[PDB]
Amino acid sequence: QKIRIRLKAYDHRVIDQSAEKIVETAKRSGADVSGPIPLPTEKSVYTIIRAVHKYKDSREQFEQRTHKRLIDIVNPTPKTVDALMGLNLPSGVDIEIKL
Amino acid sequence: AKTSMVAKQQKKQKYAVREYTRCERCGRPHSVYRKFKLCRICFRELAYKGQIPGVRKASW
Amino acid sequence: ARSIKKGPFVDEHLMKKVEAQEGSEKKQVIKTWSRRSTIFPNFIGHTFAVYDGRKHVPVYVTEDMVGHKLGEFAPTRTFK
Amino acid sequence: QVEYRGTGRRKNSVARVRLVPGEGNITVNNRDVREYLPFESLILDLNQPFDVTETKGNYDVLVNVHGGGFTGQAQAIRHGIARALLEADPEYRGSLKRAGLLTRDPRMKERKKPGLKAARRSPQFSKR
Amino acid sequence: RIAGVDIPREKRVVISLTYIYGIGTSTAQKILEEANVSADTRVKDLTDDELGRIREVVDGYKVEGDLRRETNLNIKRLMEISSYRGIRHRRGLPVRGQKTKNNARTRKGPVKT
Amino acid sequence: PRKGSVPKRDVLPDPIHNSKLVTKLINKIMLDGKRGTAQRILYSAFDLVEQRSGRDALEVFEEAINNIMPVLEVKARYQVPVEVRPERRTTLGLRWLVNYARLRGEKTMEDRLANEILDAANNTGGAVKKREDTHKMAEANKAFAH
Amino acid sequence: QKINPIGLRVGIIRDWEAKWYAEKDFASLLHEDLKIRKFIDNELKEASVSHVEIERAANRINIAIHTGKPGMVIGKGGSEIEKLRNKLNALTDKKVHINVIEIKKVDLDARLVAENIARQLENRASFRRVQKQAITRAMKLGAKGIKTQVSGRLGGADIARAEQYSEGTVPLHTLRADIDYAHAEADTTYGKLGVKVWIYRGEV
RNA sequence: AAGUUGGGCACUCUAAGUUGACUGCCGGUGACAAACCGGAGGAAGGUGGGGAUGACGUCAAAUCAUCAUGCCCCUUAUGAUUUGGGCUACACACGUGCUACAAUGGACAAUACAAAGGGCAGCGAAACCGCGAGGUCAAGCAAAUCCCAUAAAGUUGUUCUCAGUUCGGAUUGUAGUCUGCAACUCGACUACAUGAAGCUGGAAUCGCUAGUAAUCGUAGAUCAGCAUGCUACGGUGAAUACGUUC
RNA sequence: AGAACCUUACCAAAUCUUGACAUCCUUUGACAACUCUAGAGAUAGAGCCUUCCGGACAAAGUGACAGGUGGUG
Ligand SMILES: [Mg+2]
Ligand SMILES: [Mg+2]
Numbered sequence A: 001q002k003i004r005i006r007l008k009a010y011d012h013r014v015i016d017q018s019a020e021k022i023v024e025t026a027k028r029s030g031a032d033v034s035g036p037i038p039l040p041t042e043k044s045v046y047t048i049i050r051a052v053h054k055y056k057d058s059r060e061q062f063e064q065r066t067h068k069r070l071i072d073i074v075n076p077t078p079k080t081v082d083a084l085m086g087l088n089l090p091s092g093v094d095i096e097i098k099l
Numbered sequence B: 001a002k003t004s005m006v007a008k009q010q011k012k013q014k015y016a017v018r019e020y021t022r023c024e025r026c027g028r029p030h031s032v033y034r035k036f037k038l039c040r041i042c043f044r045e046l047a048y049k050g051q052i053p054g055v056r057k058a059s060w
Numbered sequence C: 001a002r003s004i005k006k007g008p009f010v011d012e013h014l015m016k017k018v019e020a021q022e023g024s025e026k027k028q029v030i031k032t033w034s035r036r037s038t039i040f041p042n043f044i045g046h047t048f049a050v051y052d053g054r055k056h057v058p059v060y061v062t063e064d065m066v067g068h069k070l071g072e073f074a075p076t077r078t079f080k
Numbered sequence D: 001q002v003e004y005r006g007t008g009r010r011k012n013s014v015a016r017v018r019l020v021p022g023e024g025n026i027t028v029n030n031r032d033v034r035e036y037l038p039f040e041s042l043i044l045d046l047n048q049p050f051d052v053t054e055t056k057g058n059y060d061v062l063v064n065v066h067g068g069g070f071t072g073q074a075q076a077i078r079h080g081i082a083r084a085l086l087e088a089d090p091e092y093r094g095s096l097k098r099a100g101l102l103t104r105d106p107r108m109k110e111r112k113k114p115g116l117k118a119a120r121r122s123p124q125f126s127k128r
Numbered sequence E: 001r002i003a004g005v006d007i008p009r010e011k012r013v014v015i016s017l018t019y020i021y022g023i024g025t026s027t028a029q030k031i032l033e034e035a036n037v038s039a040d041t042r043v044k045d046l047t048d049d050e051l052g053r054i055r056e057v058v059d060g061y062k063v064e065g066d067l068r069r070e071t072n073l074n075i076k077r078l079m080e081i082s083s084y085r086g087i088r089h090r091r092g093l094p095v096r097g098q099k100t101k102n103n104a105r106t107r108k109g110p111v112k113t
Numbered sequence F: 001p002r003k004g005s006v007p008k009r010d011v012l013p014d015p016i017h018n019s020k021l022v023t024k025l026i027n028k029i030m031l032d033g034k035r036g037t038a039q040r041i042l043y044s045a046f047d048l049v050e051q052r053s054g055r056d057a058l059e060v061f062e063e064a065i066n067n068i069m070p071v072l073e074v075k076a077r078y079q080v081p082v083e084v085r086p087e088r089r090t091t092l093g094l095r096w097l098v099n100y101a102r103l104r105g106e107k108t109m110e111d112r113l114a115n116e117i118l119d120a121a122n123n124t125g126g127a128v129k130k131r132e133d134t135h136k137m138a139e140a141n142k143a144f145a146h
Numbered sequence G: 001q002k003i004n005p006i007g008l009r010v011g012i013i014r015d016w017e018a019k020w021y022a023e024k025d026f027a028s029l030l031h032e033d034l035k036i037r038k039f040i041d042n043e044l045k046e047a048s049v050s051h052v053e054i055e056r057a058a059n060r061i062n063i064a065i066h067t068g069k070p071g072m073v074i075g076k077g078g079s080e081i082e083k084l085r086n087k088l089n090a091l092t093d094k095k096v097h098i099n100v101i102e103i104k105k106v107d108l109d110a111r112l113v114a115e116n117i118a119r120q121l122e123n124r125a126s127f128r129r130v131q132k133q134a135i136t137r138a139m140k141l142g143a144k145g146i147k148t149q150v151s152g153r154l155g156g157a158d159i160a161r162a163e164q165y166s167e168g169t170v171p172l173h174t175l176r177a178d179i180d181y182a183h184a185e186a187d188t189t190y191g192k193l194g195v196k197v198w199i200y201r202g203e204v
Numbered sequence H: 001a002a003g004u005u006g007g008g009c010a011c012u013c014u015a016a017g018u019u020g021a022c023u024g025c026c027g028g029u030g031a032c033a034a035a036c037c038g039g040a041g042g043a044a045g046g047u048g049g050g051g052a053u054g055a056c057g058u059c060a061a062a063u064c065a066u067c068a069u070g071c072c073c074c075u076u077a078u079g080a081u082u083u084g085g086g087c088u089a090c091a092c093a094c095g096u097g098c099u100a101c102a103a104u105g106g107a108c109a110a111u112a113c114a115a116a117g118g119g120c121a122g123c124g125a126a127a128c129c130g131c132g133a134g135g136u137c138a139a140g141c142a143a144a145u146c147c148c149a150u151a152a153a154g155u156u157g158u159u160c161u162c163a164g165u166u167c168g169g170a171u172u173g174u175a176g177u178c179u180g181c182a183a184c185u186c187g188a189c190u191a192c193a194u195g196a197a198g199c200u201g202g203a204a205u206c207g208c209u210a211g212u213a214a215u216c217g218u219a220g221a222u223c224a225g226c227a228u229g230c231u232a233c234g235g236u237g238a239a240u241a242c243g244u245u246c
Numbered sequence I: 001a002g003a004a005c006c007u008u009a010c011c012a013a014a015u016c017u018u019g020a021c022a023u024c025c026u027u028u029g030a031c032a033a034c035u036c037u038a039g040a041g042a043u044a045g046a047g048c049c050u051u052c053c054g055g056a057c058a059a060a061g062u063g064a065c066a067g068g069u070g071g072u073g
């Protein structure tokens, strides 16, 4: 009975600080926590022509990189479940909890 | 794009194949990205302003 | 339709126009913008005025023309 | 046990090498080196560290290698075997270092540049 | 000699059969399989019984004059009906929708600067 | 407009014959990075040369290269006879051997290479002719040696 | 020829103005943000807004408005901010929460300077004087350096030209340096005039 | 059957935080200099490789067709809507590519080794059917899990045997598949047949200094379908650089 | 960074003139997803018939006005 938390954010600093908070809250509730295991980063690269008309050779490359973190709550305790749902993370981070 | 063309793209076509994408900011027919729904010029402008989440200049 | 499972494609207006003309021997010209429509066996003996993009050009179906589109027998471009 | 372990990376290939007292037989992915690798030249490369330290025939090499191709994987083994030899004896460093076996080859594929056909290759230019 | 054509004696029969109009590599392999004649045997080393066996099978396929005549009629039909394709056959321009601003040399013949 | 000389790359000895030169020959034979075909051709050629010659393949190869390699060459500056460097001598020898082998009429490269290496040992190959021609033109320009 | 200073440093030293994560509905959220940003710009033209930061969480939009004049946007009794919120709520189904942050120094802000110089030019103010006053006020406030440029038919001249003035240091090539850049347009009778301001406040 | 699970986190990897390269140390040289050459140690040595980043200016250089805008012009029309056609024309000239001219190859068979990406109504396995392109049914999978997706060159055999061929694959006939509202003009792909030029290219001209060139496959954006283009990816992997007169 | 339609602008034919599109103003309440007929379709005419909160939103008429990938880089 492991509660799995998946975190995805565009910035790692937010994801790491969020990871620390979620792990702590569960550990404070006394649930065993393993992680936060870092999932391989996903990067999407967009190549666009820099100019408005012609000039194909000049290109600009942009990237959007999603940082992923996996957290597993080994032992489910009533306090932990409520606390994990209760935790308010920064706006950037996206959290998915599988119980 | 002309106002009528932008209007016609928005209107439901007789067939699905007839439907086409335009840049939502400016209505440019070509080079419209699906994820952002923006043309190449508009995408660049907004990325520079930091108004597209997560998008930054790429170097490697 | 090229796939066999789908039948040969004909525009309903074209087919219906031909089917109405079946009864009378003295057939009259059928004006069509349907270059895409297939020539069915039923079409034999009919003259279709198919649009070339500027004018409707008289096309008279013969046995050999069956299976080919109406557009095939009316040119869209002019050279020399 | 008496197992000496070293990791070798070449190009996009990585090799986990285990050196144990043996007859000098090499097994890669549970297959003979000669079966695994196409050319005998490749075999000469991976047995080079043994020659420098004169430890030929002392160790049987068991290798788990992933990534890259036959040359990369073969030369990945060479780096790993040498790294394992250092674990076996610290004295061998001088000999191994002089051969340049200890160095990890930093050469890697250069990215394609935008506006170029390749990393460096340029489109055919015509004035006029 | 098969289907009115003196096929090359020296070559293997799999290849020699392809010197007949209407027979290619795929067909030749089928005809030998039906006749149960080996592909490897050279025509010079073919046997009379084997040759007859091959001849029976090749008679099954439309070849040489029979095929040539059919192909010509289809093209003649297109030209007569005044099909787009037929008209291009008459003009000696690409029939299958290839661009003619450049190239089209196989159909147009050599350059006439 | 150049800073200076660049250090040259080095080759491991050939496994079969334990010669650095053999490795370099494979590199000249190789096309499009296809090492294996190049190695295959060379090793097969060395078998054929030994078979026909009845002498060690490396011996005849060494004898062949010695005949092909040129002591002097003309350089445009009037063409001036100049001494070929030891490293350049090998490059020209290997290049000429492979190129002239490719121009031979034998169906397979291995036979062409063996016929060339044998001929060069007898000092009779097209590559040998290339050296002789190079030496001739160098001697003609002896006055401009200075 | 020159990279946008903000664009180069976005995601390095400068955070994204938009702060939300989406996958399936990224396009929809972006376009909702774009309509909100446009509405605020038109609604608060009189108010001096440096930038708007949008955060999306729990089906709620959190808007942070950095304004030189906090009073105008908020309203005397907070009526104006509520009105803006209600208008935003009509535009967006999600609940909208607006936070107003005052800017202590309007002169140190590039957008506010750029908009000010544009507005003066529309009033037929001399292009030279307007830039010079802007650089002086910024330097008195302790900015490490400021650059100001106006481009177009500056004096109603038939041939357009760009004039720029600089003080202190503006290290565009230095990634560490946080440089505030903004462009504004002056809709003069002769044509559009473009004003760009680069401000280097300096480390802390 | 199988990392498959039981177990472990050793290793590998993943990705956060740190350590490392700075001429720091030691020899010479040099102006008591900056630098230079060589050495030690180090995974890496002299701005280690590559990228981003492009001063003041030049070309009244490109873009009023992304957008915006001064002025000008049209306004029962220079605005608007629909169906069809064109943008795909073809005596020719040019640029950039693709594929070849074979034996360092072609065909056939058996057998290995990547990286970097994409996916929700989307990727679609396995199985069955079709020569195949595909079809049917349908598992898993919003992703380090499932799927795209077996890399290919390669290696080992068998065969062909130097010619317009068992090279090459244009063209054309016919019979199909798929997408789509609909493949006539004008799609992609398949099967069978057909089987062009081409025998390595005049004058001339281009790219590249190493994981590069060359070569081999792989992926993505756009996208119903449609890539020899573009942007990325790894595999194999060279030759040469005396030198600065031109 | 995807021309069969669409895109698309260009051409031809068939059509419209507060207009495909915006704001305001006056008036009304469902405005229609739907079916049938004639049309190449646009569209028109018959059906219907449903929805709507001071007061939302959407129609009808007219005028203020719209529209231009027209020109000048
Ligand atoms: Mg075109
Ligand atoms: Mg200009």
Ligand SMILES: [Zn+2]
Pocket (backbone or CB within 6 Å): B023, B024, B025, B026, B027, B028, B038, B039, B040, B041, B042, B043, H066
């Ligand atoms: Zn746009």
